[PDB]
């Protein structure tokens, strides 16, 4: 009953620490990844803008 | 009465854990939004790409 | 037990949205949330800071505005 | 006293478990849509390189 219920609890919250500690790593890591995804995208767009610039120039140099 | 003092100890730690998790929850969300945004702009970006391939094939064939 | 950084982070459950800096680097920089607006506080030297602009560095602003902070010296 | 403390904490405890459950799921969905975001980038990066390669060949062709 109640003695075992309490024991279950101090066992549960003991484990809760490492759960949080892990999640904190995993969330930081994922945030990291997503950030690096955005960054990578921004570099591509810049590459597209450049390729886009160059083809307007060719079109004007040709027709 | 020291088991009620244990239980107090736990209640407080649990509050900290639940608040940290709140924050982590928020972090994950900002990641999702930054991400879903990056992924969206990159669909319009694949459109510009296919347009550029076509424009460029055109130039290849009037040479 | 959990790190002092995490315990500092846990003070951010009620932090506003729209703020250009993460509660993470704010806590890592030694500040806890004061509960008021976007205002935080160094537990240690007691420097309080608010109105955070896009791309701010919480750490650099702590070293600059209070180089004397015992905490900001270990970081 | 101790009975109601334990009953209460058993609730807050289950509450915490619920939050963490969902948070983990979302980390996983973010992790997955970042893997995919970066798979698409790999596919467009190769299309860009192909464009930049065809645009250089052309530019050389005419000065
Ligand atoms: Zn300080």
UniProtKB/Swiss-Prot annotation, chains A, D:
There is a cross-link at residue 54 (Glycyl lysine isopeptide (Lys-Gly) (interchain with G-Cter in ubiquitin)). It is found in: Cytoplasm. Residues 33-63 form a coiled coil. Residues 17-27 are annotated as: Important for interaction with BIRC2 and BIRC3. Phosphorylated at several serine residues within the first 128 amino acid residues. It comes from the Eukaryota. The coiled coil domain mediates homo- and hetero-oligomerization. Homotrimer. Heterotrimer with TRAF1. Heterotrimer with TRAF3 (via TRAF domain). The domain containing the RING-type and the first TRAF-type zinc finger can also form homodimers (in vitro). Interacts with TNFRSF1B/TNFR2. Interacts with TNFRSF5/CD40. Interacts with TNFRSF4, TNFRSF7/CD27, TNFRSF8/CD30, TNFRSF9/CD137, TNFRSF11A/RANK, TNFRSF13B/TACI, TNFRSF14, TNFRSF16/NGFR, TNFRSF17/BCMA, TNFRSF18/AITR, TNFRSF19/TROY, TNFRSF19L/RELT and EDAR. Stimulation of TNF-alpha receptor TNFRSF1A leads to the formation of two distinct signaling complexes. Belongs to the TNF receptor-associated factor family. A subfamily. This is TNF receptor-associated factor 2. It comes from Homo sapiens (Human). The lineage of its organism: Eukaryota, Metazoa, Chordata, Craniata, Vertebrata. The chain holds residues 267 to 329 of 501 of the full protein.
Swiss-Prot record, chain B:
Residues 2-63 form a coiled coil. Signal peptide: none annotated. There is a cross-link at residues 5, 13 (Glycyl lysine isopeptide (Lys-Gly) (interchain with G-Cter in ubiquitin)). It comes from the Eukaryota. Polyubiquitinated by BIRC2 and/or BIRC3, leading to its subsequent proteasomal degradation. Ubiquitinated by the SCF(FBXL2) complex, leading to its degradation by the proteasome. Adapter molecule that regulates the activation of NF-kappa-B and JNK. Plays a role in the regulation of cell survival and apoptosis. The heterotrimer formed by TRAF1 and TRAF2 is part of a E3 ubiquitin-protein ligase complex that promotes ubiquitination of target proteins, such as MAP3K14. The TRAF1/TRAF2 complex recruits the antiapoptotic E3 protein-ubiquitin ligases BIRC2 and BIRC3 to TNFRSF1B/TNFR2. Homotrimer. Heterotrimer with TRAF2. Interacts with TNFRSF1A/TNFR1, TNFRSF1B/TNFR2, TNFRSF4, TNFRSF5/CD40, TNFRSF8/CD30, TNFRSF9/CD137, TNFRSF11A/RANK, TNFRSF13C, TNFRSF18/AITR, TNFRSF17/BCMA, TNFRSF19/TROY, TNFRSF19L/RELT, XEDAR, EDAR, Epstein-Barr virus BNFL1/LMP-1, TANK/ITRAF, TRAIP and RIPK2. Interacts with BIRC2 and BIRC3 N-terminus; a single BIRC2 or BIRC3 molecule interacts with a heterotrimer formed by TRAF1 and TRAF2. Interacts with NFATC2IP, TRAFD1 and with HIVEP3. Interacts with MAP3K14. Interacts with GPS2. The coiled coil domain mediates homo- and hetero-oligomerization. The MATH/TRAF domain binds to receptor cytoplasmic domains. This is TNF receptor-associated factor 1. It comes from Homo sapiens (Human). The lineage of its organism: Eukaryota, Metazoa, Chordata, Craniata, Vertebrata. The chain holds residues 181 to 243 of 416 of the full protein.
UniProtKB/Swiss-Prot annotation, chain C:
Highly expressed in fetal lung, and kidney. In the adult, expression is mainly seen in lymphoid tissues, including spleen, thymus and peripheral blood lymphocytes. It is linked to A chromosomal aberration involving BIRC3 is recurrent in low-grade mucosa-associated lymphoid tissue (MALT lymphoma). Translocation t(11;18)(q21;q21) with MALT1. This translocation is found in approximately 50% of cytogenetically abnormal low-grade MALT lymphoma. Multi-functional protein which regulates not only caspases and apoptosis, but also modulates inflammatory signaling and immunity, mitogenic kinase signaling and cell proliferation, as well as cell invasion and metastasis. Acts as an E3 ubiquitin-protein ligase regulating NF-kappa-B signaling and regulates both canonical and non-canonical NF-kappa-B signaling by acting in opposite directions: acts as a positive regulator of the canonical pathway and suppresses constitutive activation of non-canonical NF-kappa-B signaling. Auto-ubiquitinated and degraded by the proteasome in apoptotic cells. Belongs to the IAP family. Interacts with PRSS25; interaction inhibits apoptotic suppressor activity. The BIR motifs region interacts with TNF receptor associated factors 1 and 2 (TRAF1 and TRAF2) to form a heteromeric complex, which is then recruited to the tumor necrosis factor receptor 2 (TNFR2). Interaction with TRAF2 is required for ubiquitination of IKBKE, degradation of NFKBIA and activation of NF-kappa-B. Interacts with RIP1, RIP2, RIP3, RIP4 and USP19. The chain holds residues 26 to 99 of 604 of the full protein. The gene is BIRC3. It comes from Homo sapiens. This is Baculoviral IAP repeat-containing protein 3. BIR repeats lie at residues 5-72. Signal peptide: none annotated. It is found in: Cytoplasm; Nucleus.
